[PDB]
Amino acid sequence: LPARVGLGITTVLTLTTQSSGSRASLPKVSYVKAIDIWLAVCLLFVFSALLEYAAVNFVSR
Structure with a gap:
């Protein structure tokens, strides 16, 4: 179960x-889809992480 965490992420x-496909090529189609697919991960993950520390101060665990 614990590993499933890091593994899932x-x-x-x-x-x-991959979803971003910037290094692969990023011609135009892959760019349009990329900015919506991985951002869904980059946006949620980064925001939640910052909110994670901000809670570091809220909860003070």
Whole structure:
């Protein structure tokens, strides 16, 4: 179960690289879809992470 965490995210992380397709080529079609697919991960993951620390201050665990 614990590993499923990092594993699930890293799976998303793979998508972060692939879904974006910036390094692969990023001609135009892949760019349009990329900015909506991985951003869905980059946006939620980054925002939640910042909110995670901001809670670091809220909860003060």
